[PDB]
Amino acid sequence: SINNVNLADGNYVVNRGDGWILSRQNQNLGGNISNNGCTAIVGDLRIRETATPYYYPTASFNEEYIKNNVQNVFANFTEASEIPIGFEFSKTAPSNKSLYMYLQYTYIRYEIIKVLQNTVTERAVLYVPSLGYVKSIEFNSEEQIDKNFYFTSQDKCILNEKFIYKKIDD
Amino acid sequence: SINNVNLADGNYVVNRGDGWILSRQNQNLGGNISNNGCTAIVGDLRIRETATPYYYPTASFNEEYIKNNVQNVFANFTEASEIPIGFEFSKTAPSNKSLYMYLQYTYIRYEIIKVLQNTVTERAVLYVPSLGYVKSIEFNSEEQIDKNFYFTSQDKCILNEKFIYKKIDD
Amino acid sequence: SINNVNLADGNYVVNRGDGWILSRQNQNLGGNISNNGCTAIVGDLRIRETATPYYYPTASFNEEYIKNNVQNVFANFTEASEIPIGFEFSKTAPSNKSLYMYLQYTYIRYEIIKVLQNTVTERAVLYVPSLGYVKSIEFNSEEQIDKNFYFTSQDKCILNEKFIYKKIDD
Amino acid sequence: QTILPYPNGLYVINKGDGYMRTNDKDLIGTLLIESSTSGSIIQPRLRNTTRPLFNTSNPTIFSQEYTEARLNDAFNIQLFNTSTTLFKFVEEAPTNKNISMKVYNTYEKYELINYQNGNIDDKAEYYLPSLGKCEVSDAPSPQAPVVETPVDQDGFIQTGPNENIIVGVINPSENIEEISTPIPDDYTYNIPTSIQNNACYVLFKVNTTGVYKITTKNNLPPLIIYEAIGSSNRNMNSNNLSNDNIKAIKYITGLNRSDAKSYLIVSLFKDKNYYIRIPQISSSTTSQLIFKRELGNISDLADSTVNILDNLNTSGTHYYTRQSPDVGNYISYQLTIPGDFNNIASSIFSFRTRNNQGIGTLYRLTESINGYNLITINNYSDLLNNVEPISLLNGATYIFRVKVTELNNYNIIFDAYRNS
Amino acid sequence: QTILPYPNGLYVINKGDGYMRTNDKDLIGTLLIESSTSGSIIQPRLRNTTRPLFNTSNPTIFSQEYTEARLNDAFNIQLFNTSTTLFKFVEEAPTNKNISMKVYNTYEKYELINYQNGNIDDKAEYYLPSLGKCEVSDAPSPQAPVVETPVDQDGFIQTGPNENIIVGVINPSENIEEISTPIPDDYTYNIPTSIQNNACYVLFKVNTTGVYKITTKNNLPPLIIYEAIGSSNRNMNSNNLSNDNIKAIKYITGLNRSDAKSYLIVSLFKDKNYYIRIPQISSSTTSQLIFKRELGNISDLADSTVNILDNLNTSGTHYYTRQSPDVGNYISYQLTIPGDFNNIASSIFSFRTRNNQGIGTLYRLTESINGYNLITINNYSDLLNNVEPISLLNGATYIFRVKVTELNNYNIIFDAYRNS
Amino acid sequence: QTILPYPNGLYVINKGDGYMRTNDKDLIGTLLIESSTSGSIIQPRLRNTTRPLFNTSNPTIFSQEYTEARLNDAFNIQLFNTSTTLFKFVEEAPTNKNISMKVYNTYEKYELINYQNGNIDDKAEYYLPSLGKCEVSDAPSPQAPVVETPVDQDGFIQTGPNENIIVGVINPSENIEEISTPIPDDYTYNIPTSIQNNACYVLFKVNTTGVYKITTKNNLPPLIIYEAIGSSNRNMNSNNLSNDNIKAIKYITGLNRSDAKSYLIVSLFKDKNYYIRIPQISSSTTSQLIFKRELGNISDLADSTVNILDNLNTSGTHYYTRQSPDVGNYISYQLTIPGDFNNIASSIFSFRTRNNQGIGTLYRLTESINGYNLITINNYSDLLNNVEPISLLNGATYIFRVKVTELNNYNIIFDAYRNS
Numbered sequence A, B, C: 001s002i003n004n005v006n007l008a009d010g011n012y013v014v015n016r017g018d019g020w021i022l023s024r025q026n027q028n029l030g031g032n033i034s035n036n037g038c039t040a041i042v043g044d045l046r047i048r049e050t051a052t053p054y055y056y057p058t059a060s061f062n063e064e065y066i067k068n069n070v071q072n073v074f075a076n077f078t079e080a081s082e083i084p085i086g087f088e089f090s091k092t093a094p095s096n097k098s099l100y101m102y103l104q105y106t107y108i109r110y111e112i113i114k115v116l117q118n119t120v121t122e123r124a125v126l127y128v129p130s131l132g133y134v135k136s137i138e139f140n141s142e143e144q145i146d147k148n149f150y151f152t153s154q155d156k157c158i159l160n161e162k163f164i165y166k167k168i169d170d
Numbered sequence D, E, F: 001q002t003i004l005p006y007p008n009g010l011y012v013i014n015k016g017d018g019y020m021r022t023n024d025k026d027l028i029g030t031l032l033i034e035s036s037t038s039g040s041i042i043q044p045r046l047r048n049t050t051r052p053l054f055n056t057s058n059p060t061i062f063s064q065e066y067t068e069a070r071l072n073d074a075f076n077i078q079l080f081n082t083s084t085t086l087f088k089f090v091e092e093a094p095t096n097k098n099i100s101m102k103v104y105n106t107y108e109k110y111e112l113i114n115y116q117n118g119n120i121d122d123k124a125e126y127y128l129p130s131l132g133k134c135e136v137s138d139a140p141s142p143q144a145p146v147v148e149t150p151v152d153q154d155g156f157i158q159t160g161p162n163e164n165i166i167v168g169v170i171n172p173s174e175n176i177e178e179i180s181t182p183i184p185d186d187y188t189y190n191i192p193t194s195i196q197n198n199a200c201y202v203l204f205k206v207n208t209t210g211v212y213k214i215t216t217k218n219n220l221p222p223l224i225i226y227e228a229i230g231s232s233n234r235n236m237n238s239n240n241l242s243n244d245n246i247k248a249i250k251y252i253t254g255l256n257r258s259d260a261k262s263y264l265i266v267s268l269f270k271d272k273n274y275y276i277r278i279p280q281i282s283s284s285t286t287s288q289l290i291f292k293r294e295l296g297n298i299s300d301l302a303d304s305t306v307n308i309l310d311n312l313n314t315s316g317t318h319y320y321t322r323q324s325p326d327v328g329n330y331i332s333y334q335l336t337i338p339g340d341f342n343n344i345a346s347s348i349f350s351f352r353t354r355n356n357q358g359i360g361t362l363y364r365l366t367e368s369i370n371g372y373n374l375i376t377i378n379n380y381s382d383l384l385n386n387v388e389p390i391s392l393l394n395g396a397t398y399i400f401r402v403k404v405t406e407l408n409n410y411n412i413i414f415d416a417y418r419n420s
């Protein structure tokens, strides 16, 4: 399953990759509607004030342990957070149809795992605010939409998941 | 004429429509010049500080009466005014010619009318700052220009005029 | 040479033209890298705070003498400096190649010359911050680059040099 | 106005995007874009303020702050009246004509309801500020004749694509209990005395993925089970249940009806967290919660409330009113035929339903030292009109599974008609 | 240096956009845009400050603040030294060459003048900060030989399209009187004693659209009438004149010359507001303003000053110097032939003009209980060279209408040459 | 790890742009751009703060502030930890696929080194914040199998184009002397007593462009000359040297070796400023700096250190180790043949080099009342393997010029082999 790793016994810090979207937060930022060849644009600014990290600590790994161990091997998100970064998406609505696009934040998934016998015994999780992602759909008041378009029930990555590790010491 | 309405006797609040430009204010914001295939862009921000309403009260209808009655049926421009909104226009100058475009604010015309015998007896007028409109013209130091291009002597609507009413009570 | 002018004896203020880049400051602002058809954009804001003038006074012509005499005939850069102005450049990287562009400030070269016998005896120089200029180059980790692309050893003008004068009085 | 196949409690319904008020009350502006020109309207967030719209049927309890709290439990919305999210529209007019560009502010409509026994007793509507709507069309003629038109009725119209996403939230007035250790194959939980004062939820996770039978030692009161949405694949501890205070719950199966003697059979995955809602036990005798992993095709009932049928030793109709599962879902009934057991002794039965239509499956429940086992006796492609009788061995136990195919009413009526 | 066919007073002239100073004093910067690259220069208004340029011939009266006040009366300009209006230029260079992009700040030139008897006695120039100018061209060669060039003369050059829009403003030093009630078919206004100290304006509106005769009871002093620009279709009250304090005025017709005995015939629309400027009446005898709606083809004189000719009972030339109307506009003359009336008795006349050219129309004024009536006696396609005589019935009254076709001089000279 | 053909001192090396840390430590973010959609990542400088990276081998002396000061002397960089320069990337995805857009922060790597006798004794690396890097590619599959991959080693990788620009700076611990007046054809400078305590630089300019011989009156110590980069065509005064405090210096020619008895022959332009570095003269006897403009083909040695060879009156090898010029540059040797002068009397010689390869030119130095004059005796296209002997007139003086064609070692060894 998801706990079978081919690593010696110990504690590791893993970069699960950029591109993670969180469960059911799909439409928290709102959606945009346009039509007849109009171009629609949505963007943001992950200013430290807004974009805040999501911690999921365990007994062996508390918030601090997770942070320091992540910012030590990978991008120091605490420093980076002081410098505003923007991103936008644009799409042109079809000639005689309506377009709907909604935006949501993406994240980098970091994990702190306790390995024992090539199996994960404990797992802490951190989601560091990254940028954003938009989903579009053409429509009319007549179309029924697959509700999975609007809702994500389990955290997932819109890119390819990763597993870049480094055994923790001390 | 302009005072013949097919409405029962009473006081009404009317939405004359968006797209109104005011008399002789044509070039108050200035104009832009470009040439040889260059793209020219002009825009603004109707920040409450600038974009201010134009009231034309009568005896039966004072400023307050006009405002409250308008913001009650139609868009509450007093609240909206706290949130900055921008708009821009762009146009590409011709290959070997000069382009001139000037900008001016557009408005929504609201009216408070006193009807009696299918005729307007009294009429109050409100112009709520909307967005903007630009006029272009190609030229050279040799061309004479129709002066109506630069000057509007009577308030008018660049879109189709409207007449959306609601009888006032009390 | 560069000191032979066809002017009567006296002191003149000369506009050597816009478009001057300074010696070895080529990459002070940094460079930008992109690839595979991506569009790259770099810009700035010569806000008074940053963009500061470069004075090269002589005995006969001190800083003040240079400024007042320049702002008297040509653009008053001291006033203009209070109003922020921006500029940008964009370029699309080639389909399967890398693009590198770096930005540097441009200037207007002003001179205060002492003429005697159709020859410059003394010369003061002022560089007023103008806008900016970008240089691009396509590349790969294999290409060797002409180092003159990265370094300018002697002040020069990227446009055509000028010589617009006016004899100073008093 | 349709049926809501859910248990009593609180639900937050995302009713869609693109909502705006009538009479252009949300019109930002209109641009007249002349031919060979481009126009643009922008919400640059030079100010992060936004103005949410709120409407409630009970200001005391369902206050705006309360509703916002629910919305947070359901979708985890952080910002309600601020935004740093920009939206802009750009349109170029053709060379032949003029274009009209209208832009409106919009809202996502979130509905908060207190759902009780197929009824909504409380309700609030929260309009979350959205990212606008832009309408472009051929510019109207400045000469177009003006038509006196009366203002529309005050209200909202939906502009975005059809959407109706239901999310249940933990009832904030009912406490949460927690079984710290991942439950093994067998487990008994003693229901705290607090249960005498109000219902509670019991948060837990199973150590081993599989099917489970869950119930109170007397099959009363009925239990309801939920999944903690998004709980899977986050923090984990083999020897301990990591909490995420996830208040968003997905109804699996269960009922509220008082006399629904029953037990649950559901498929549970170890990487997820679940909630069992135990109703208020108004008694001084300690109740229990028994968990048991089941091996075998008892899993055929996977995610279903097995209702034990009583008062069978009579003739004729035997109705059982229960909250109907949603189309596609199950609801089961267990029958121990009146009389003693000797193969030959039988009784004639005719299974039927009355409100909702569905597909039936009759199983013969059997025992083994390897757990249970179901033997398919027959299948029914029409329960609402079934007349086919079946003879069942007296003293034997059968389980009838119903898959709802048509949700006409809140309750599904099961009729175990006895012919002899 | 051309003729200004307007009455004495203040005028604000929009002389066009694109004005900038010489020697690149308004150059923002130049971008060298290499091939296959795009360049852009922006005025983002990160600071709203702008720097207007001012120039006056009389700092005491025509101060900058005063001039700004006039500009406000004329075009209603609100902001003089601030702007939130952005302007940006974008240019892509071709694949084959390099482009040079120059951007300059610009100004709209507003001219304020005190116009007195065909002469400008005071003048100020206000340069309103505009939205720039951008020049793109093939990038010059870095090797292009440098040419010693002397700086140009200090000053302004016009870069925008040709424009010259004249707008008159109420003289701020002359008070405004107001006839509150819409004037009916007949109305007499008593000129307040303040008229002894300086000219005044009388603001009013007619209850019924039509042609009107307006004058002082002795056809002296001459009157001038204006239209309040933009006054139509705003606030209105059938029983009252709604004011808009509109100080922008459009000259209809009227004269300043002291001895121009006359009355006005103009077309007035009820939805508009008008201003009649009454000159300073240096006398202790109360003057009056008589209004009378006219029915009939007297409207042929629509918008015209009807000058009553005196000292006709002589022979030869009879010159009358008056301020010339603009090309396309009218100016009339009324003649009551010397002698008593008996059809047969006549006198020979030759109508002619001297400074400006025009088209003449001779009318025979007649009376009826249904108002007046004009009978066309003859038309003239050349007044500056007319020699054709005409015999007019003595004791009868004729009106000669002149339509200016050529404005060569400030004054138009009318000659009612008497042959007998 | 290659040879650095430069004299002792400080150098700032721009090692290129596009530097970033491993393990995505500089990753700003990734956008998944769906087909027919455009994505963009922006550094808008809403905050001007930037974070430079620093690394030194000697924190005491080569502190960050010190290194920054050097970088300022070399490239005149003003802002080290702030920027108002924006960078943005835009990419549209095709209609057929999805694009992945990754953006990273980057740095320009500036290397500060204390170079002593072909060795780096101190070193610091300053990573100046740059304008980013953007990688676009086909979006990876969300299903792509995850591969356990160990983190890379902590460090930097170069992403930009190859670059290595060396710039020398005035050693800040060695004082600067200045010859105020443009030196005429002949000039002698008395070296201040400060020279006893440490080396100094003498800033000057020549009044007339041409070739010059520069040296100490005993051809000891050796001198080094530099050009003040960017000093040409700025402020100027015919009667005075205008200073620009330019600390960026371009090595022309010269050596550090203690016993390199010599003088310099270089081409100097009046519009430029130069620096002569005089080593520390540990003596109480005042030294001098003699300047002399040379007319004639002595200019053939243009920009070269002429090393005077000693101890020639022996047989066999005569090695002379000197710091090697860079490929393409010169280094000369002067020979006065042992013995008295009478045309016929000669000695056989074989010129050769040992570490680096080059092209040799043998000149016969002659005197005239019109200056010097060189007569080419022979040329050598291979010095590292030359065996061809040459007979030189005893008591005569010859100059051998070497043009380096191959830089294999820090030092170039010259061998004036005597055959007889």
Ligand SMILES: CC(=O)N[C@@H]1[C@@H](O)[C@H](O[C@@H]2O[C@H](CO)[C@H](O)[C@H](O[C@]3(C(=O)O)C[C@H](O)[C@@H](NC(C)=O)[C@H]([C@H](O)[C@H](O)CO)O3)[C@H]2O)[C@@H](CO)O[C@H]1O
Pocket: D259, D260, D261, D308, D309, D310, D311, D312, D318, D319, D320, D321, D322
């Ligand atoms: C004011 C008040 O307390 N309300 C009562 C109300 O409870 C009562 O309703 C009946 O309540 C009994 C439980 O005591 C049953 O629930 C009855 O419903 C049925 C059903 O539809 O399921 C009737 C059915 O006939 C029964 N089936 C059999 C085989 O007997 C089932 C069955 O007992 C249960 O489902 C348990 O398995 O119950 C329900 O009508 C009404 C009486 O109508 O009176 C109110 O005052």
Ligand SMILES: CC(=O)N[C@@H]1[C@@H](O)[C@H](O[C@@H]2O[C@H](CO)[C@H](O)[C@H](O[C@]3(C(=O)O)C[C@H](O)[C@@H](NC(C)=O)[C@H]([C@H](O)[C@H](O)CO)O3)[C@H]2O)[C@@H](CO)O[C@H]1O
Pocket: E259, E260, E261, E308, E309, E310, E311, E312, E318, E319, E320, E321, E322
């Ligand atoms: C210092 C001073 O006061 N100025 C006088 C100046 O007024 C005067 O000019 C003459 O003034 C009389 C009015 O009193 C007329 O306006 C004269 O002009 C004419 C005209 O051109 O219109 C002359 C013409 O011959 C007259 N026509 C006839 C038929 O008589 C008309 C006519 O009277 C009026 O138009 C009224 O209908 O007036 C004008 O020259 C001069 C004398 O030249 O002296 C100054 O000192």
Ligand SMILES: CC(=O)N[C@@H]1[C@@H](O)[C@H](O[C@@H]2O[C@H](CO)[C@H](O)[C@H](O[C@]3(C(=O)O)C[C@H](O)[C@@H](NC(C)=O)[C@H]([C@H](O)[C@H](O)CO)O3)[C@H]2O)[C@@H](CO)O[C@H]1O
Pocket: F259, F260, F261, F308, F309, F310, F311, F312, F318, F319, F320, F321, F322
């Ligand atoms: C601890 C200490 O003081 N160091 C000495 C070290 O100086 C010395 O090295 C020798 O030093 C002499 C100078 O006194 C020369 O520089 C020697 O180098 C050569 C050279 O390679 O150029 C040797 C060569 O044979 C010489 N050529 C001739 C024709 O004699 C030249 C020549 O004298 C100079 O170039 C001047 O023109 O010098 C160098 O080896 C060593 C002894 O090996 O001892 C250390 O302790």
